């Protein structure tokens, strides 16, 4: 159970390599122990590990526009609201309620669905910047 | 000057509105035409059967609402886009 | 204030049921738009003709059932749907 | 209780029988929908080209037999289906 052990298993397994062991032991104590490792091919000459806290998925951003801070080219949300739609999201006419609930309320939304047409992310990108919604897709 | 003929009006169409019910800001196909318009020329009136000519109730200066359709036709005049559509096309007049 | 013209008439459709002869839900397209509604304004009359008006038998406040069609439109005013209509499409009055 | 607009009649259909001619059943399409309803409700008339109202031929409580087509209507009232359609689709009357 503790480090030490499992240091020593991760080495011997590993042909005697020393850091190997190290490495395995910090990042199964940092991902806890329902986490998940993974390995995968890096760029450089020295091996190294990301932990990632929270919840990420590789969905990323459905129009460039929406980027408020260019000097890291991401989009970042303070205390937002999320809506979750299963539906195909294409009429802006479905969508007017909440949007402005959110505009009186004043705070970030973020809409996470499977997609969004062209009209639909037009309008909410013309209302990015105007500074009526900050609004993610 | 321009004057319709018979029971025919010429109306001015309204600017289509780009917030609806907050500052939220509509630009596409979202954002229908405008179906109100001003009066600006109102004919002397339908023509009967029996050959009197009844007034039209619309008068100028009101505004009304008017469905479009193709007996609808857009001419310019003054550099100036207008609308000469019968009398018949005019559902209702606001106050 | 909306007024209509001739044999116009402004009604709006009354909500959508969603129990049915009991407690079970109905959601989806089995829940048909309601054809019943309450009449609005009321226009002066049909020009007959010779040439004189006579008023409609619908008066405002009564409970009427209408024919959904292509003549049948539906605007936008004061932030509420209404529909004009012609008095033909006017099929029965409740009580 | 609704009264009808104009030259229009309530009219409630027969239900289809299962024994013709015999006492061999029909289900399927075979048994088409019953051509012969009885009148419940009866407008003023039909209102004439002078101005003056005439009053229908048919009266409440009598058998008519109608043909079913585009102006025939159906809706449900005290959860019971009724059908409106003119006068004009009337074909005839029973005894």
């Given at each position: 159970s503790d480090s030490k052990a499992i240091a020593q298993v991760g080495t011997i397994s590993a042909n005697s390599d020393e850091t190997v062991g190290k490495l395995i032991a910090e990042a199964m104590d940092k991902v806890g122990k329902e986490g998940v490792i993974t390995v995968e091919d890096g760029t450089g000459l020295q091996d190294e590990l990301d932990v990632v806290e929270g919840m990420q998925f590789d969905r990323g951003y459905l129009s460039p526009y929406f980027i408020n801070k260019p000097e890291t080219g991401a989009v970042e949300l303070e205390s937002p609201f999320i809506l979750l739609a299963?539906?195909?999201?294409?009429?802006?006419r479905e969508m007017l309620p909440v949007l402005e609930a959110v505009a009186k309320a004043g705070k970030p939304l973020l809409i996470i669905a499977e997609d969004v047409e062209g009209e639909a992310l037009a309008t909410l990108v013309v209302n990015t910047m105007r500074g009526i919604v900050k609004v993610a897709a | 000057n321009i004057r319709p003929l018979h029971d025919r009006v010429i109306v001015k169409r309204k600017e289509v509105e780009?917030?609806?019910?907050?500052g939220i800001v509509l630009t596409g196909?979202?954002?229908?035409?405008?179906?109100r318009g001003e009066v600006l020329a109102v004919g002397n009136g339908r023509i009967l059967e029996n050959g009197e000519v009844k007034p039209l109730d619309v008068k100028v200066g009101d505004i009304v609402i008017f469905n479009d359709g193709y007996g609808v036709k857009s001419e310019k005049i003054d550099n100036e886009e207008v609308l000469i559509m019968?009398?018949?096309?005019?559902?209702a007049i606001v106050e």
């Open positions: 299963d539906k195909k999201i294409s009429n802006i | 780009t917030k609806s019910a907050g196909s979202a954002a229908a035409k405008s179906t019968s009398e018949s096309d005019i559902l």
